[PDB]
Amino acid sequence: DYKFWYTQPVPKINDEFNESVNEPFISDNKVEDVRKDEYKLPPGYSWYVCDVKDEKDRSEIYTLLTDNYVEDDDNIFRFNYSAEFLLWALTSPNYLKTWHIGVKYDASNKLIGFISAIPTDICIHKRTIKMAEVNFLCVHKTLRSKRLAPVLIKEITRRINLENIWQAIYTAGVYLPKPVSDARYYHRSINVKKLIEIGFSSLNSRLTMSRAIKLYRVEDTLNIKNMRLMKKKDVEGVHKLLGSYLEQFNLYAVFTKEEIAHWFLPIENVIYTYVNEENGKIKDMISFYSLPSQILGNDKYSTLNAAYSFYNVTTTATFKQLMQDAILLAKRNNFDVFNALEVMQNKSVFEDLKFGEGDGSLKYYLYNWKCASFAPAHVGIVLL
Ligand SMILES: C#CCCCCCCCCCCCC(=O)SCCNC(=O)CCNC(=O)[C@H](O)C(C)(C)COP(=O)(O)OP(=O)(O)OC[C@H]1O[C@@H](n2cnc3c(N)ncnc32)[C@H](O)[C@@H]1OP(=O)(O)O
Ligand SMILES: [Cl-]
Ligand SMILES: [Cl-]
Ligand SMILES: [Mg+2]
Known part of the structure; x- marks a missing residue:
């Protein structure tokens, strides 16, 4: 009603x-x-x-x-x-x-x-x-x-x-009047055994524990070798690379340089941004934020440490390669799982990079605005 x-x-x-x-x-x-x-x-x-x-x-x-x-x-x-x-x-x-x-x-x-x-x-x-x-x-x-x-x-x-x-x-996650877009989460297991043990993932007679661990194993080498933590010197560069990418989407934040410094400069256990600088230009970037969940009444683990994809742009690699690097960087930072919405180019990598479909979806809303709705690949904003 x-x-x-x-x-x-x-x-x-x-x-x-x-x-x-x-x-x-x-x-x-x-x-x-x-x-x-x-x-x-x-x-x-x-x-x-x-x-x-x-x-x-x-x-x-x-x-x-x-x-x-x-x-x-x-x-x-x-x-x-x-x-x-x-x-x-x-x-x-x-x-x-x-x-x-x-x-x-x-x-x-x-x-x-x-x-x-x-x-x-x-x-x-x-x-x-x-x-x-x-x-x-x-x-x-x-x-x-x-x-x-x-x-x-x-x-x-x-x-x-x-x-x-x-x-x-x-x-x-709840349906309200009325979404401008609707995007499922997908999850890529990193710490497979812990995800099983807490009831996040499952196994079967074809997928044994050992076979699941092997399925989700990641090579500890970056596709983009020079990906490194972002510093203040990189703010003008990220502002141009991300700013130019986002303009193609139906919905996105128009970031100032001050906003880029605030939303991307790394803060341990909160926000992680990596850049690839070539010729004094920032040509690729990966970013993900930390959002743990409390595991309700679990004896062994109190916390699921999850990385949520934020903004990723490549001009020197394929999107697949870039996102395989983001999962690597989240693994190197102790995360148990890397989660992403089917927004921007993300859904195109989910099959090949072994993501699983999550339950339900996240609805995007505007207040006091009438416009056409669109498929979530045209969404170019990730809220926290
Ligand atoms: C300029 C300008 C405009 C600025 C405002 C724009 C509108 C912003 C809307 C709010 C956006 C929220 C974004 C989020 O942060 S997301 C996460 C929500 N955090 C949780 O999921 C935590 C767990 N959960 C709760 O803490 C409570 O369940 C809630 C969510 C506070 C709801 O409280 P409760 O005690 O259930 O419900 P009551 O107080 O009787 O209220 C019923 C009315 O409320 C609507 N509602 C419910 N959930 C909502 C919700 N999530 N966002 C908006 N509205 C919601 C609902 O439909 C119904 O109204 P009706 O009668 O159907 O027209
Ligand atoms: Cl490496
Ligand atoms: Cl009054
Ligand atoms: Mg209430």
Whole structure:
């Protein structure tokens, strides 16, 4: 029935727009007319502005998400974004502290809800629009189905609109009105025995343990020999190589040089970017971020260490060769599995590089924007 969503400027479930339509649902917005009062919470609850740069505030967000954030459809894994990852994800160029919004239960002073956004220029069907990218919506497990999520969404919408920003981008596994694109995850096992043991992968009479280990074995030699960790000197180069690649897609972030430094410069256990420099030019790049899952009630392993593909571009090798190198670099950094969405060129390598299809998919959404939807190979943005 979507009783909340059908109040909002998003498409109905059966809306179909053709390529001649690429504009807002609601235009001519004025900051002057945005509500200046905070949305009302149920009695006993209060808004709290989180300071993500403060270690203690950040640890409170970390705890809320560790305990209550997204699980796989089978409730076997729960994402466990690290505190240093959250610091990176939320303090991008020009971020607003006041879009990092928490809800405390007053009687215990405990954070029980959170939602966040950061600002970025998004190009959709060649039109570039300032958007908020919304993420980390989370309601404590003990307070589910009480309609707190619409309150957090309406309050962040209000605060984003105060900055004269009227569109947003967000992804989710749940189906909501209405995806602009839909992309499955695929996974490439690295630490095969651990993935078996925790119930992530399986074996059969044809695929014995030893045969599975051999199937997923990787040669410890790079196809692109000079791939090395990115440094500050490489920011102009990555800005040109990635910037030029992305222009072909129907949906992508238009990164400034400051944004390139922020999103790609390596941070241990958070973001890994490797470059190939030839003649003072950056000609290939690989990048992947760290997102572990807590393995729910497992005796042996508490954590699945997963690398998620971010942005990969080659001009000196094949895409296959580049992605075989990304799996190698993730292996050299202790990751158990390399995951990727069927966006950009990724699906073209999945068969040959022995990826498995994951369950369900990730839906891409715009708020207050009507346009044609498209196949996920035309998506050129990866959100965290
Ligand atoms: C400018 C501008 C606009 C700015 C705003 C743009 C819109 C942004 C939307 C939010 C985007 C979120 C992106 C993500 O971060 S992804 C990960 C979501 N994090 C989890 O998966 C963690 C585990 N899970 C939870 O923590 C809770 O289940 C949630 C997700 C907070 C939902 O809370 P609960 O207690 O279930 O549900 P209640 O409070 O009764 O709310 C029901 C209404 O809510 C809608 N809803 C549910 N999940 C949603 C969701 N994931 N995103 C958006 N809406 C969602 C839903 O359909 C329904 O509304 P209807 O009646 O159907 O029209
Ligand atoms: Cl009022
Ligand atoms: Cl090597
Ligand atoms: Mg609720």
